[PDB]
C-alpha cells in the first residue's frame, strides 16, 4: 500500500493539479471585465503554490518510503523519475515566475 | 532525533538565514548617509559567510547519519532536495558573487 500511495502521488502532479489550474484560469479570463494582468498573476501564484506544496508532499513521502530492502527501490523510482518529474516541475517553476 | 535535527536544518536554511540577511541588509541601507556600495558588499560577505557554513554542516549531518539498514533516508531527502536545495544555495552564492 505504500507503493500504491507513491504511484498515486506521482501520478496526479501534471493531470489533476495542472489541468485544474488551467481550467480555473480559463474561467477567470473568459468573463469580460476581469483584469487579465491580475488574472495571470493570480493563477501564477496558485500555480507556484500547487507546485511547491505537491513537491513538499513528495518530500515527506519519499522520506517515509524507508522500508528495509525495498525503500532503496522507491529511491531508484525517484531517480528514474527525476527527469520527467523535473520536466513538469520545470513547467510550473518557469510559468510561475513568468506569469 | 536524527530525523528531527535533519529537518530542522534543511527547513531552517532557506527561510531563517535568507530572511535574516535580507532584514539586516534593509536595516543597513535604510540608515541615512551610509555608503550603499560597501553595504551591499558586506551583505555579500554575509551571503558567502553563512551559505557555505550551512553547506558544510550539511556535510556533517548527512555523513553523520550512516545508520545501517535505513541510512538511505539521507539519500532520499538529499536527492529530491538537490534541485531546490541548489535553488537556494546557488541563489545565495550568486548574490554575493554579484555584489
Amino acid at each position: 500500500e505504500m507503493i500504491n500511495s507513491i504511484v498515486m502521488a506521482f501520478l496526479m502532479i501534471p493531470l489533476q493539479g495542472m489541468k485544474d489550474i488551467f481550467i480555473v484560469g480559463v474561467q477567470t479570463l473568459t468573463q469580460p471585465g476581469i483584469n487579465p494582468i491580475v488574472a495571470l498573476a493570480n493563477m501564477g501564484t496558485m500555480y507556484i503554490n500547487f507546485s511547491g506544496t505537491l513537491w513538499l508532499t513528495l518530500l515527506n513521502m519519499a522520506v517515509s518510503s524507508l522500508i528495509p530492502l525495498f525503500g532503496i527501490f522507491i529511491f531508484a523510482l525517484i531517480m528514474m523519475a527525476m527527469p520527467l518529474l523535473m520536466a513538469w516541475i520545470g513547467t510550473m517553476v518557469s510559468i510561475g515566475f513568468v506569469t | 532525533e536524527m530525523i528531527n535535527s535533519i529537518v530542522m536544518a534543511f527547513l531552517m536554511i532557506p527561510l531563517q538565514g535568507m530572511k535574516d540577511i535580507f532584514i539586516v541588509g534593509v536595516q543597513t541601507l535604510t540608515q541615512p548617509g551610509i555608503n550603499p556600495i560597501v553595504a551591499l558588499a558586506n551583505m555579500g560577505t554575509m551571503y558567502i559567510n553563512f551559505s557555505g557554513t550551512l553547506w558544510l554542516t550539511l556535510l556533517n549531518m548527512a555523513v553523520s547519519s550512516l545508520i545501517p539498514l535505513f541510512g538511505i533516508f539521507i539519500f532520499a531527502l538529499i536527492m529530491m532536495a538537490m534541485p531546490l536545495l541548489m535553488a537556494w544555495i546557488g541563489t545565495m552564492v550568486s548574490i554575493g558573487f554579484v555584489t
Binding site: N60, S64 | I3, L11, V38
Partner: protein
C-alpha cells in the same frame, strides 16, 4: 586629499550557531565532573569491600602483583588534580616573544607520571580550547619591557588603538581562557557533588530509610522541569519557560527539587562576564582611518592607466564623505565526551586501553553501568534513554519529562530551555508549520 553590557537571555543565541561551542564545552566539563566523582566513589566502595575481606582472594591469598598494588594503593581525588591554568602554562613556552601554541588539550581527569593511574587519564573525556590568536601575532612583546597594542597605520590584529601592557598584565591576558574554564570547573563542582550525592546507588551507606518515596532508582529527589510563567509544564520551548518545578505523581509521589534551572546558564553568564574585560581590551578612530588617504600619493607617483584599480578605494572615501559582545572561536566545541568508555574494556576477556581497570573489577560492569545510567539513563530508566543534546540554537527543542528528567543529559536539555530574567532574545522558526514533516 583636501576633502571629497550583555543581555543574559541574548547569550543563548551565542551558545551555539555552528561557530561557537562554549555551551558544548560546559556540557563536556559538567559530564566530566560527574565522571570524576562517580568513578571516585565506586573505586572507594570497591576498595573498602576488598580490604574488608583481607583474608581471602584477591587482596589475600596469592594475588597477582597488579591486584596487590591496587589493594595497597589508596584512591586520590580527581577533582583536585584537574585544573587548566597549570596545563596551559606547561604547554606555552615561558618566553613571551615566541609564537604561542595554537590550541590546548586537557584530558580529564589529570594525573602526573608518578601517579600509577596514568592509563585512567582521559577516561572522563577531554576538553580543548585554542589560544587567543589576536595576541599570539607579533605585537612587539618584550620579556621585561613594555608592549603596545597595534593602532592605526601598521599591520594590526587588535583594534585601531594603542595601549601599554607590561609583562605581568600580558601573561595574565594569556590566561583568559584558563581561568575561564577554571571558573566553569569551580561553579559546576557543587552541582556535580549534589548530583552524585542524589543517587541512592552512590549512597555507600546501607540506608534502610524510605525506599518508597524516591523519585527513581537513580535519584531520591528529582531535579525538576522547566515551567512556564503561569506555572505549568513547559514541554516545548515555543511556550515561554521561566521557572523550575517538580512533576506530581512521578512515581506515586512528588519530591523536592534541588535547583532552579539556572545553574547551567549561571555558569555561562559568569563565563561571559569574565571574558568581557579580555575581549574589551582586545578591541581597544574606528570609523575612520588615515590609511584610506595614503593611496593618493602613490596614485600621483603611479599614473592614470591604473585608475580603475583604486575604484573600491574611492568608494571607501566618498562614502565616508557622505557618512552585546560574545566570544567567538573559543574552541570548547572541539572537546569530546564519550560515556561508553567505562564499559569499553569489558567482554569475554578485557581489552586495551583500560584492561587493568577491568582486572581490578574482576570483569564486572555493574558499578560502571550505574555511572552510565547516571549520565544518560541506560538501563535503569529503560534500555534506551536520552541522547547527547544539541546545544546549538534549536527553537524546536523538547524538554524531557518523567523519570528521564532525572538524568544528567536530560537535566542539561531542560536547563537550556529556560529563559533568564532578561528579556527573551531567541527567535524561533518563523514558519515551522509551513514545512511540516509527517513520519512515524
Amino acid at each position: 586629499n583636501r576633502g571629497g553590557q550583555a543581555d543574559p537571555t541574548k547569550s543563548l543565541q551565542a551558545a551555539g550557531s555552528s561557530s561557537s561551542g562554549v555551551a558544548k564545552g560546559a556540557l563536556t566539563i559538567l559530564g566530566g565532573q560527574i565522571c570524576m566523582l562517580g568513578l571516585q566513589k565506586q573505586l572507594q566502595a570497591q576498595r573498602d569491600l576488598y580490604l574488608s575481606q583481607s583474608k581471602s582472594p584477591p587482596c589475600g591469598g596469592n594475588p597477582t602483583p597488579e591486584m596487590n598494588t591496587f589493594c595497597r594503593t589508596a584512591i586520590p581525588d580527581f577533582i583536585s588534580t584537574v585544573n587548566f591554568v597549570k596545563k596551559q602554562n606547561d604547554d606555552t613556552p615561558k618566553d613571551l616573544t615566541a609564537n604561542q601554541p595554537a590550541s590546548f588539550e586537557l584530558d580529564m581527569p589529570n594525573f602526573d607520571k608518578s601517579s600509577p593511574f596514568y592509563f585512567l587519564n582521559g577516561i572522563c573525556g577531554t576538553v580543548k580550547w585554542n589560544n587567543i590568536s589576536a595576541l599570539n601575532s607579533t605585537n612587539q612583546s618584550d620579556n621585561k619591557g613594555l608592549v603596545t597594542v597595534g593602532g592605526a597605520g601598521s599591520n594590526s590584529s587588535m583594534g585601531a588603538n594603542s595601549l601599554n601592557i607590561t609583562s605581568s598584565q600580558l601573561q595574565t591576558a594569556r590566561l583568559s581562557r584558563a581561568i575561564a574554564i577554571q571558573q566553569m570547573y569551580v561553579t559546576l563542582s557543587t552541582v556535580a557533588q549534589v548530583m552524585v550525592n542524589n543517587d541512592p546507588a552512590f549512597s555507600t551507606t546501607t540506608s534502610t530509610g524510605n525506599s518508597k518515596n524516591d523519585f527513581s532508582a537513580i535519584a531520591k529527589q528529582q531535579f525538576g522541569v522547566p515551567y512556564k510563567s503561569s506555572g505549568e509544564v513547559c514541554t516545548e520551548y515555543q511556550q515561554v519557560c521561566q521557572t523550575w518545578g517538580s512533576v506530581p505523581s512521578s512515581t506515586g509521589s512528588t519530591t523536592g527539587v534541588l535547583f532552579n534551572g539556572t545553574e547551567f546558564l549561571g555558569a555561562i553568564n559568569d563565563y561571559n562576564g569574565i571574558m568581557m574585560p579580555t575581549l574589551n581590551l582586545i578591541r581597544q578612530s574606528k570609523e575612520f582611518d588615515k590609511k584610506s588617504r595614503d593611496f593618493i600619493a602613490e596614485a600621483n607617483a603611479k599614473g592614470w592607466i591604473m585608475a580603475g584599480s583604486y575604484f573600491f578605494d574611492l568608494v571607501k572615501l566618498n562614502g565616508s564623505a557622505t557618512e552585546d559582545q560574545f566570544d567567538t572561536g573559543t574552541g570548547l566545541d572541539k572537546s569530546s565526551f564519550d560515556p561508553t568508555q567505562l564499559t569499553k574494556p569489558f567482554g569475554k576477556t578485557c581489552q586495551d586501553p583500560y584492561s587493568l581497570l577491568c582486572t581490578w573489577f574482576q570483569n564486572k560492569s555493574d558499578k560502571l553501568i550505574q555511572i552510565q545510567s547516571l549520565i544518560d539513563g541506560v538501563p535503569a530508566l529503560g534500555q534506551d534513554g536520552v541522547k547527547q543534546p544539541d546545544l546549538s540554537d534549536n527553537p524546536q527543542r523538547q524538554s524531557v519529562s518523567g523519570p528521564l528528567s532525572s538524568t544528567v543529559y536530560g537535566f542539561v536539555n531542560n536547563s537550556m530551555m529556560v529563559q533568564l530574567p532578561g528579556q527573551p532574545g531567541i527567535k524561533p522558526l518563523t514558519f515551522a508549520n509551513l514545512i511540516n514533516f509527517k513520519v512515524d
